[PDB]
Amino acid sequence: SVANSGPISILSYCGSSILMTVTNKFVVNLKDFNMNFVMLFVQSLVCTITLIILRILGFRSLNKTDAKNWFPISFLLVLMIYTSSKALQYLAVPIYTIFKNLTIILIAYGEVLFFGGSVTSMELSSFLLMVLSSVVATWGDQAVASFNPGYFWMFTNCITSALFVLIMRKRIKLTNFKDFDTMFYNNVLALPILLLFSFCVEDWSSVNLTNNFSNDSLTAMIISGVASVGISYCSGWCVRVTSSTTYSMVGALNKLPIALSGLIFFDAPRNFLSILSIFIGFLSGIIYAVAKQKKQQAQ
Amino acid sequence: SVANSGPISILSYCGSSILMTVTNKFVVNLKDFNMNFVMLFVQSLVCTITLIILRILGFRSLNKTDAKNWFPISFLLVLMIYTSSKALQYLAVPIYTIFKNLTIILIAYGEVLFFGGSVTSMELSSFLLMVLSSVVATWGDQQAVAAAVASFNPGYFWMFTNCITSALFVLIMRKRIKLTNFKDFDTMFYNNVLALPILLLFSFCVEDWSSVNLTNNFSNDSLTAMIISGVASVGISYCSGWCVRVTSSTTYSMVGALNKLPIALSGLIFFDAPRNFLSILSIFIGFLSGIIYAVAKQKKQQAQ
Ligand SMILES: CCCCCCCC/C=C\CCCCCCCC(=O)OC[C@H](O)CO
Ligand SMILES: CCCCCCCC/C=C\CCCCCCCC(=O)OC[C@H](O)CO
Ligand SMILES: CCCCCCCC/C=C\CCCCCCCC(=O)OC[C@H](O)CO
Ligand SMILES: CCCCCCCC/C=C\CCCCCCCC(=O)OC[C@H](O)CO
Ligand SMILES: CCCCCCCC/C=C\CCCCCCCC(=O)OC[C@H](O)CO
């Protein structure tokens, strides 16, 4: 419709990402959770409950042909989170961001194998400025046994992150899936996969978990669940109206203003290299915006 | 000359750079010289002497209009060396290579202000892959830690001045060559002849001239070594002036940056020494930069 198109999705995805970040560190802080998949299962329950309440007050659709075709997308999503968490267990945050910025390039070249586009030299220049940014951020920061665990799990996160955004955006365009339908299938079908994943990788010790996962944590999972409502709708909107590359680019660009806020609002020590990485990352988004503007007038 | 065109100049500039590197570390090694400008003055004397002998056996030209127009080029050259040496005094080698790769971008955008071209998005992609390479080489290195901010400070000023003088030199030299149809033997002659007084004046201002304390250091051994390194510099001085002319100021600075990679790969192949994956990765990223830069130039020919 009127507002379901163009850069509105980007601005909305950004705002929803900002709201989710401030809620997780100010409202529902100290969320160093022992049962992350259970937390995401409650987050996906809140999103489903909101969707059903909003449908009976006005949207979306329920099926079984679309369900068996959407199941790999939902499986890829849960596996993407699993490989990401396992990669971050052994790998450092600035290092994780390098490979996460490297996925943008294979998502860009992967979209040429899925939709038949072309990665213009200017888009390729921006992706390189995004890698440069993540590298100078790591550069400005402080054994074979420790090497291989983190790197293997990062390689698997790279392929799952790519396949997920590429296959999801393919099915949406194939089954004329509007935003609210995409949000629904992603959260409804995730519910069993999130449960099955938690049983295989998390501890379920009765009394030792009842005192930790009490009324306080339950309230916190619901509040973080309410915060995730926007971003879950917006990510599925972003991929659809723009592209899988633009979504992963906007996602990488979003980390910069929250990092700049830490430098502005909080009296904390920093090096010039970490400050430089933020502005290199900005130049990447600026020239990526021009690259898209160039495509319109050249196609 | 006919075979005085295209990639032949690049191959020649590369080979002459290789010969100069192997001579300085195998033939005339232990060249940790106290009087570097005096060494370059003998190198420029050898080049001049070779040019005069070869002219009377067969070339070039002698003038006064071209001399006052080539004087800033020769001054920029000696100043380029002075700022480079002063930058390297405070700044680490992998760090120096980052800014040296960053000059390629301002040489590329500077050539648009001098010749009126265009830095195609593909060329811009290659320059970024060249910066990426130098950065991951510095990242995968621990030689940067050299020994309060009262110890490390003037390095970045001397590096910034080297960046502008390296750019201006290659941009103004190529401009004059194309203007005065200078070919190659004239560009080599005017660079070395006009450098002679500037190299002398620079050595008097920044180097020690203590009589007996230098006579025993700068003996018959060092004199022979300056002549041999002077013979090695004959090729590269002709080829650099050839490269800038037939290709471009950007291609010359790109080929110059690309040249450091095969000599580094030779160190990994020929010599049993320890290394990290990042330093190995930087070499192949640098190769991808040259490969996509070659395609970028091939794209320009069919699109102009
Ligand atoms: C273990 C960690 C490994 C880290 C690895 C980092 C180095 C790879 C970086 C970039 C690849 C770029 C290659 C693809 C670009 C080729 C040029 C291209 O496709 O340009 C546009 C085209 O010409 C339009 O027609
Ligand atoms: C392929 C790239 C990604 C890498 C592969 C990721 C995993 C693949 C999925 C399922 C494996 C089977 C999981 C089901 C079995 C549970 C495994 C486990 O943790 O078993 C311990 C057991 O529960 C103690 O009682
Ligand atoms: C030490 C680390 C602590 C970090 C503390 C985090 C605090 C986050 C709060 C507010 C910033 C939110 C960002 C607000 C500005 C967003 C601007 C925006 O979206 O700009 C798009 C632009 O206009 C397109 O051209
Ligand atoms: C030591 C000092 C500690 C201080 C700690 C403060 C933490 C940050 C708080 C608020 C920033 C949030 C601003 C978010 C508003 C949205 C950004 C924006 O662009 O707003 C424009 C307009 O007003 C609406 O769109
Ligand atoms: C210790 C190391 C510190 C340094 C770390 C590396 C710094 C990299 C920053 C910038 C690259 C230069 C700018 C690249 C080009 C910017 C965009 C531009 O100029 O675009 C015009 C183009 O023609 C449109 O197609």
Swiss-Prot record, chain A:
It is found in: Golgi apparatus membrane; Cytoplasmic vesicle membrane; Endoplasmic reticulum membrane. This is GDP-mannose transporter 1. Residues 58-74, 123-126, 168-181, 240-245, 292-299 are cytoplasmic. Changing N254A: Decreases transport activity and GDP-mannose-binding. Pfam families: UAA. Involved in the import of GDP-mannose from the cytoplasm into the Golgi lumen. Defective copy causes severe glycosylation defect and abnormal retention of soluble endoplasmic reticulum proteins. Involved in vanadate sensitivity. GO terms for cellular component: cytoplasmic vesicle membrane; endoplasmic reticulum membrane; Golgi apparatus; Golgi membrane; mitochondrion. The gene is VRG4. Changing P257A: Decreases transport activity and GDP-mannose-binding. It comes from the Eukaryota. InterPro entries: SCL35B1-4/HUT1 (IPR013657), TPT_transporter (IPR050186). It is a multi-pass membrane protein.
From Swiss-Prot, chain B:
Residues 23-36, 96-101, 208-223, 272-275 are lumenal. It is found in: Golgi apparatus membrane; Cytoplasmic vesicle membrane; Endoplasmic reticulum membrane. The chain crosses the membrane at residues 2-22, 37-57, 75-95, 102-122, 127-147, 152-172, 187-207, 224-244, 251-271, 276-296. Its main location: Golgi. Changing T251A: Decreases transport activity and GDP-mannose-binding. GO terms for molecular function: antiporter activity; GDP-mannose transmembrane transporter activity. One of its GO terms (cellular component) is mitochondrion. SUPFAM superfamilies: Multidrug resistance efflux transporter EmrE (SSF103481). It is a multi-pass membrane protein. The keyword Transport applies. Residues 297-304 are annotated as: RET2-binding. GDP-alpha-D-mannose binds at T250, T251, Y252, S253, M254, V255, G256, A257, L258, N259, K260, L261, P262. InterPro entries: SCL35B1-4/HUT1, TPT_transporter. PANTHER family: SOLUTE CARRIER FAMILY 35. Present with 31900 molecules/cell in log phase SD medium. Homooligomer. This is GDP-mannose transporter 1. It comes from Saccharomyces cerevisiae (strain ATCC 204508 / S288c) (Baker's yeast). The gene is VRG4.
